[PDB]
Design a protein around this nucleic acid. Structure first.
Lengths: 124, 177, 173, 35, 143
RNA sequence: UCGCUCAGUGGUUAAGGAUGUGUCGUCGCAUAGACAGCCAGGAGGUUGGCUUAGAAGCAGCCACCCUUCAAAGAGUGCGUA
């Protein structure tokens, strides 16, 4: 649900990034490239949509990066194989920003749910 | 911090590194005090002290003319602790220092009536006790909430005097026998 | 709301409460500082709306405005931003925001609160000021109307950037 | 049950200063948790 | 009528309580009706075959029943030049429901026998929205 | 000089928390001596139209106009078909 092919690759490395923007309502940013298992962010919106409403659309500022290549475990003493994992990784970018009112950040309350690390909401 | 209170001129306090006690109509309250906290009498009224700034007189003081109440109950004040009960009758006599409490099993369980709360009895339907302790006034009140616990339905035993406590419910409500 | 300070280094720019500060007025560079108490009176109600003074240590009096907003990336400790001061003859960067406000007449078919997540607008402003008076977000969200960026209630004059046709608020419930 | 930053939940829930807790005591009668 | 009364409020329909379905002997055992439904909302409740008629229905230790009720035409003169159809759906959706322009005169000009106010700029302020639940547009306002 | 100070961490450890704490900015305000712990006010058109047994302040959709009076909520939570 990211690329459709265009060859494997990628490496590692942590720090911060660049993708922060002055929000119009009530922002929310990551703080370093924390932990989101792809098949975690594959439960980021639905969990932010248990029943917030019949309809309703806002905005995010990220997109699945990934592949990792994990390989079996019969005898790890070789090269590689293929991804079969997936991950997003980010900086301190926006990802929510509500536009209602009384609700405030109800869906930015169980966002921290699928978040082993720290991801404040802030506001702007 | 406090100081004001309600009591005429019929009581005297010590002034000896914590040894104090009351001496009115039956009291001799246990006092025991530190060393950084003391204060001496100043007449029919009292005063406030602060021989040392900060957190040193706000853990053991700023509420000293308060525990006086623990002794006020009797030296001039009253005492009563009055409750009612509905868990199978209301009977309790002392004939010494051993109320029997008529409820449930032949298997005794008798408690040992202390000095000051040792019961009087007069009215059976609702025991009366001259608890001049203020240590075991509400505790004894609680002496029947650890075993004979009231039924979680109608409005029995444990009750103060008249509140919106109501009687517990569940699914609906009914009772017979 | 005073000034003073000096430090040509990032020493007192990374020490508890302070900032970094920048100035480049006509024959007036240097990098001051100042504390950071009620130093978040930018995007609140003072966003170019009005222009007081400052009384800097020694000479002159420059009104100036706010020069957009910025806060801080991720956290909330606004790392150094910027600060415009009307005294130049040709920079850019204007702060003409576009909000979202109301009950959201989205429950007509299906649609929530006016989203928008950007932080950039088709704007221009000649001199350097950036007034405070504009709406655009409302106007019967449905179809056969819409209200975005291209002309609107536009500051004062016309606009100049590159290609006048961003996106901003829009509708699409 | 649970021993970490789990917040107040209903201001009625006093924090309690003990050994090193955080506590949470409802608003009336329902839950009396403690670590 | 020993020395105390009851209370309780009910939305007594068009009198249905004789066969069974409605609420005959289902609402009468502690002193409601049983053997009297007529000449007690059927009395002067026959000025029409479909109204409302409010009352506080006294319920004493005895069973005789007579009268003592409110004044229902208070809330009926604005409930018979309309009906129950395409009126109450989901208020706030388009432009549904309408009464009449001139019918915004004697449709607030009925607050005096019951409305404890009943005055100028007072006998039409409480009732200035009755079909508010239907969510429609004034077109007039009690002039 | 002196704080966090009281857990023995400091001598294997974290996403989430508890109204513990030395200290910097606002607020409706106890120089109307507010709220936070009470006495008295606690009802009318409408007890709202509608799924209609009544649903009548609370099994439902929707909706918030005024009244005795110098003001008072289309009703949070209790009982509950």
């Amino acid at each position: 649900t990211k690329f459709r092919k265009q060859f494997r690759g990628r490496m590692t490395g942590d720090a911060k990034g660049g993708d922060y923007v002055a929000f119009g309502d009530y922002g929310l940013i990551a703080m370093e490239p924390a932990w989101i298992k792809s098949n975690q962010i594959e439960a980021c919106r639905i969990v932010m949509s248990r029943h917030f409403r019949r309809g309703g659309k806002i905005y995010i500022r990220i997109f699945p990066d990934k592949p990792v290549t994990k390989k079996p475990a019969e005898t790890r003493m070789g090269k590689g194989k293929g991804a079969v994992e997936y991950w997003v990784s980010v900086v301190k970018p926006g990802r929510v920003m509500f536009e209602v009112a009384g609700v405030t950040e109800e869906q930015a309350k169980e966002a921290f749910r699928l978040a082993g690390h720290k991801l404040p909401i802030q506001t702007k | 911090g406090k100081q004001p209170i309600a009591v005429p001129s019929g009581v005297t306090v010590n002034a000896q590194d914590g040894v104090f006690k009351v001496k009115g109509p039956k009291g001799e309250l246990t006092v025991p005090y530190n060393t950084e906290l003391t204060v001496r009498q100043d007449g029919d009224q009292l005063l406030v002290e602060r021989p040392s700034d900060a957190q040193k007189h706000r853990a053991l003081h700023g509420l000293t003319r308060t525990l006086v109440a623990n002794a006020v109950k009797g030296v001039s004040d009253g005492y009563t602790i009055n409750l009612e009960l509905r868990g199978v009758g209301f009977r309790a006599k002392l004939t010494g220092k051993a109320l029997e409490m008529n409820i449930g099993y032949s298997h005794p369980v008798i408690i040992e009536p202390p000095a000051g709360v040792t019961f009087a009895v007069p009215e059976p339907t609702r025991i009366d006790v001259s608890g001049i302790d203020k240590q075991l006034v509400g505790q004894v009140a609680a002496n029947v909430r650890k075993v004979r616990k009231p039924d979680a339905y109608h409005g029995k035993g444990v009750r103060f005097v008249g509140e919106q406590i109501a009687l517990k419910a569940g699914k609906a409500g009914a009772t017979g026998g | 709301m005073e000034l003073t300070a000096k430090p040509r280094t990032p020493k007192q720019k990374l020490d508890e409460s302070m900032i970094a500060a920048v100035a480049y007025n006509k024959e007036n560079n240097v990098s001051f500082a100042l504390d950071r108490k009620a130093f978040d009176r930018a995007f609140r109600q003072q966003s170019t709306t009005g222009l007081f003074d400052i009384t800097v240590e020694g000479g002159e009096t420059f009104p100036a405005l706010v020069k957009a907003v910025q806060m801080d990336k991720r956290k909330r400790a606004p790392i150094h931003v910027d600060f415009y001061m009307v005294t130049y003859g040709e920079p850019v960067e204007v702060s003409v925001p576009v909000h979202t406000t109301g009950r959201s007449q989205g429950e007509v078919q299906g649609g929530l609160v006016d989203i928008v997540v950007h932080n950039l607008q088709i704007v221009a402003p000649g001199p350097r000021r950036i007034p405070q008076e504009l709406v655009v977000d409302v106007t019967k969200m449905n179809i056969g109307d819409h209200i975005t960026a291209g002309d609107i209630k536009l500051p004062e004059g016309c606009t100049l950037a590159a290609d006048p046709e961003l996106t901003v608020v829009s509708v699409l419930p | 049950k649970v021993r970490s930053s789990v917040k107040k939940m209903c201001d009625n829930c006093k924090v309690v200063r003990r050994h090193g807790r955080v506590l949470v005591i409802c608003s009336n009668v329902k839950h009396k948790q403690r670590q | 009528m020993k020395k105390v009364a009851g209370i309780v409020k009910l939305q007594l329909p068009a009198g249905k309580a004789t066969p069974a379905p409605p609420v005959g002997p289902a609402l009468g055992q502690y002193g409601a009706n049983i053997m009297e439904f007529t000449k007690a909302f059927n009395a002067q409740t026959a000025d029409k075959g479909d109204a409302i008629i409010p009352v506080e229905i006294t319920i004493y230790a005895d069973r005789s029943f007579t009268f003592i009720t409110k004044t229902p035409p208070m809330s009926y003169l604005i409930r018979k030049a309309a009906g129950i159809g395409k009126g109450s759906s989901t208020p706030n959706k388009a432009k549904v429901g309408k009464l009449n322009w001139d019918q915004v005169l004697e449709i607030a000009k009925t607050k005096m026998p019951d409305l404890n106010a009943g005055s100028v700029e007072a006998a039409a302020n409480t009732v200035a929205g009755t079909a508010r639940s239907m969510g429609v547009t004034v077109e007039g306002g009690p002039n």
